[PDB]
Write a structure and sequence with these properties.
- The PDB classes it as viral protein.
- The entry lists the keywords Immune Evasion, viral protein.
- SARS-CoV-2 Nsp1 bound to a pre-40S-like ribosome complex.
- This is part of a larger assembly, with chains A, B and C.
- Chain A is mainly beta.
- Chain A has one domain.
- Helix content of chain A is 6%, strand content 30%.
- Chain A has helices at 23-26, 47-51; strands at residues 71-78, 84-95, 100-111, 124-129, 139-145.
- Chain A has a five-stranded antiparallel sheet with strand order 3-2-1-4-5, with no helix packed on it.
- The relative contact order of chain A is 0.18.
- Chain B has helices at 43-50, 57-64, 247-256, and strands spanning 41-42, 69-71, 74-75, 82-83, 88-91, 96-99, 111-112, 120-131, 135-140, 145-147, 158-162, 168-172, 179-182, 191-198, 206-210, 216-220, 224-226.
- The N and C termini of chain B lie far apart (57 Å).
- By secondary structure, chain B is mostly beta strands.
- Chain B folds into three domains: 1-116, no CATH class; 121-171, no CATH class; 174-244, no CATH class.
- By secondary structure, chain C is α+β, with helices and mostly antiparallel strands.
- Chain C has one domain (1-141).
- A six-stranded antiparallel sheet of chain C has the order 3-2-1-4-5-6.
- The radius of gyration of chain C is 21 Å and the shape is elongated.
- Chain C starts with 8 loop residues before the first helix and ends in an 8-residue tail after the last helix.
- Classes of the chains: A mainly beta, B mainly beta, C alpha+beta.
- Chain B binds four RNA strands through strand 9, strand 10, strand 16 and helix 3.
RNA sequence: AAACUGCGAAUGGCUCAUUAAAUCAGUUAUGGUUCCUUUGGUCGCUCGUACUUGGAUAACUGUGGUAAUUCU
RNA sequence: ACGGGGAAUCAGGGUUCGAUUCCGGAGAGGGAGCCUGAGAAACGGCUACCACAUCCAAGGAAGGCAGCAGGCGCGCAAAUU
RNA sequence: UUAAAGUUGCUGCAGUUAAAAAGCUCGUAGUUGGAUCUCUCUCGGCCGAAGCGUUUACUUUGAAAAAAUUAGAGUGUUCAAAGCAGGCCGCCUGGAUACCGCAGCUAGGAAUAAUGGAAUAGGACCGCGGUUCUAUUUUGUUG
RNA sequence: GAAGACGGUCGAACUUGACUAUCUAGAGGAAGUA
């Protein structure tokens, strides 16, 4: 329950969890030691990462990805898939003949780790480039900042 | 393509070889080797286009096949063998020794050195790894690997090789106040003192270098070669001292060389 | 008046490229119907077989009979009336002849007096009409 | 000479039919891969007939088939 | 419509071209499948089908110029076996 | 096919009568929007490493941007289009430089133009308090 | 260790339909064209 919802046993692959022990620790405090790492670009790992119990192999903090490439940022529009959200990135494109600009946008399906709970729509995520996680997913949510009005 | 390419068109050759347009369709196309083909001199270009010892590629074949050319102490019969930055080309029959060092305009100069100097060279360490029962390793900028270096040698330092043994004699560390040559980009061939290094994580670092006359320029970190310690270079420097003149003062020097000579 | 703001580049260029189709020169050379109606198919010259000599009558404020030639083109089988320029140059033209036909000058419109004729003859039997007219060559036998 | 072995024949040359975020250009990444060759490293690190091992097959000799092949 | 570097024109802004010797892609009549090899879905390699087409003693055998020349065709339009 | 064409108009056209303004009001996107606010903390040698300062646009800089082509320096191909050579009596000297939009990097500037922050105070700065877990220094050694 | 065969896969092509497009043989006619 609460993790094992799939047909296969979910576990962090780096942590061995069947270390035998004597009854003074076998009965006293039962804690699976969590694997987490520190991604390197000044981003600090959230609290829910290092103490949570979720298992996500695509999480940037407790899974097997590395963050290298482009740091970008968008705004959450759709939260309707399993562990992956859709952001929108707005920019101005310079047309040279008219010396002017036009509002364009591009969508990005991006992977959202379960360590970012309380993510609304309309708020600004920071995304980092990883290896291709899916057919259309190449980025990963690294930092969430709320919208302007949510006190 | 269905595989690796073997030709080089003459227009797409590197600019600093100073080939011209009309003598052929092809360029010499360097062999694979210790230096990159955008960063090397093939031995055929050094021996007939620079030294004028030959007039054809056939004569370069005849000169090299008599085993007369040693590059870094070893005989090379390959006429497209890529010589590169700070290689010692030593012709024993004429008693000449050369080192490939960039000019202030970013081309390899015909720099003659004494046979005292022709027994060493400087290399830039690009990679350190520990491998297979804890033996530390180097990888220099010309594909040498060295087992058991000094443990103070770190990446981006500059070591000194003895060309017969292949072993390190001493080294310079990467620090502000040491002397550089730029080996890449716009600032190629310039020489000065490190004053600064700003570290951008996940990307390229930028090193600020100060010229001997107070000019200042930046490069990337990979385009930096530490020549000497403090101000003293550990090698002999070419005609210009790594001080790039502007076009106005180069014109003034070229005109002052005509009103005095003649 | 027209929009002028700093972010109006999409409104400005999508309006210009839609008002560009109201120009006669753009609509002619960017639609493709006028190129499929051109019997030359965009070529400068063409070649055809002379079907019959034809006298076309001049338009009203002057009076003569212009000496044209009805010619069926080789490359697509379209039929064409084409004007034979100088005098006694219809005498040089037999029937079922190879002929070389150019445009007449106004790029598909009928040059002044001759009604509905867009073309003129340049060569006949691979000899130019100017060489026959000035007596430099003769028609082969 | 021939033939076996090895390497090359994936480069070059030609053309512009397809192809409209595709190709391509600038920029980045492989910490997500493979790499003949060149260059350097490594190659008594292993505790268990050798002063040299075995069977063939071309070229060659000889007998041929098919109207016909760089066939056999 | 192969894409770029680029080209013509030009007060300034622009408009049109880029098949074409440099770089990148693609394809070897049309599709498909492979062997060998570090590297090919290779075509001056192989195996089929489709369309063409060659030699034949009628049993069978062989093919691929969008390489250099050259020929036919096509055309307004382009060179030496 | 380009200029002529200010006859496609961004610079830069026109809409009473020459071609032309919607029957009227509402109204989403888009476009455009009134004044207003004058840098520091631990170490390493008084300065740097550690933070940036709300976030961008803008601007200036830097480096990175194939050659050829274009602009352009030198040089009497006999001149020139070209070429990259050449010049003294073995020497001497070249084979420069600029431009390369947009997108992406770097560093200064802070006017203009967006955006943020304390109004159920869940506000800042302070000392004081309580709850939970923990760095490993601490007991010649070891437990 | 060859021929061969069961199966699987990739898959050109073949047949019959349906829709759609083109090239060609095709009576009749109409209007305008002059």
């Amino acid at each position: 329950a609460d993790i094992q919802t799939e047909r296969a046993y979910q576990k962090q692959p780096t942590i061995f969890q069947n270390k035998k022990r004597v009854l003074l620790g076998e009965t006293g405090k039962e804690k699976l030691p969590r694997y987490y790492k520190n991604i390197g670009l000044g981003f600090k790992t959230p609290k829910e990462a290092i103490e949570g119990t979720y298992i996500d192999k695509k999480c940037p903090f407790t899974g097997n990805v590395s963050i290298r490439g482009r740091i970008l940022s968008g705004v959450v529009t759709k939260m309707k898939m399993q562990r992956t959200i859709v952001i929108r990135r707005d920019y101005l494109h310079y047309i040279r003949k008219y010396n002017r600009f036009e509002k364009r946008h591009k969508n990005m399906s991006v992977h959202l780790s379960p360590c970012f709970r309380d993510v609304q729509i309309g708020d600004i995520v920071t995304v980092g480039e990883c290896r291709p996680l899916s057919k259309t997913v190449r980025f990963n949510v690294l930092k969430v900042t709320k919208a302007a009005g949510t006190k | 393509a269905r595989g690796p390419k073997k030709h080089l068109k003459r227009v797409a050759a590197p600019k600093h070889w100073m080939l011209d347009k009309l003598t052929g369709v092809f360029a010499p196309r360097p062999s694979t080797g210790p230096h990159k083909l955008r960063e090397c001199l093939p031995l055929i270009i050094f021996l007939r286009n620079r030294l004028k010892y030959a007039l054809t590629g056939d004569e370069v074949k005849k000169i090299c096949m008599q085993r007369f050319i040693k590059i870094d102490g070893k005989v090379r019969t390959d006429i497209t063998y890529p010589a590169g930055f700070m290689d010692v080309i030593s012709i024993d029959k004429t008693g000449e020794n050369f080192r490939l060092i960039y000019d202030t305009k970013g081309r390899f100069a015909v720099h003659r050195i004494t046979p005292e100097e022709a027994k060493y060279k400087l290399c830039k360490v690009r990679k350190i790894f520990v491998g297979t029962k804890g033996i530390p390793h180097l990888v220099t900028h010309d594909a040498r690997t060295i087992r058991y270096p000094d443990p103070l040698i770190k990446v981006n330092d500059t070591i000194q090789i003895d060309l017969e043994t292949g072993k390190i004699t001493d080294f310079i560390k990467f620090d502000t106040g040491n002397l550089c040559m730029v080996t890449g980009g716009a600032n190629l061939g310039r020489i000065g003192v490190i004053t600064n290094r700003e570290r951008h994580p996940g990307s390229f670092d930028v090193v600020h270098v100060k010229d001997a006359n107070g000019n200042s320029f930046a490069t990337r970190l990979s385009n930096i070669f530490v020549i000497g310690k403090g101000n003293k270079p550990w090698i002999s420097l070419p005609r210009g001292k790594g001080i790039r003149l502007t076009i106005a003062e180069e014109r003034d020097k070229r005109l002052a060389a005509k009103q005095s000579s003649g | 008046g027209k929009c002028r703001g700093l972010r109006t580049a999409r409104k400005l260029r999508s309006h210009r490229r839609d008002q560009k189709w109201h120009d006669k020169q753009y609509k002619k050379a960017h639609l493709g119907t006028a190129l499929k109606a051109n019997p030359f198919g965009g070529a400068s010259h063409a070649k055809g077989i002379v079907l019959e000599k034809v006298g076309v009558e001049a338009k009203q404020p002057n009076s003569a009979i212009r000496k044209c030639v009805r010619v069926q083109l080789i490359k697509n089988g379209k039929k064409i009336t084409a004007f034979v320029p100088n005098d006694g140059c219809l005498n040089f033209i037999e029937e079922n002849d190879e002929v070389l036909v150019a445009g007449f000058g106004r790029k598909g419109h009928a040059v002044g007096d001759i009604p509905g004729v867009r073309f003129k003859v340049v060569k006949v039997a691979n000899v130019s009409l100017l060489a026959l007219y000035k007596g430099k060559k003769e028609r082969p036998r």
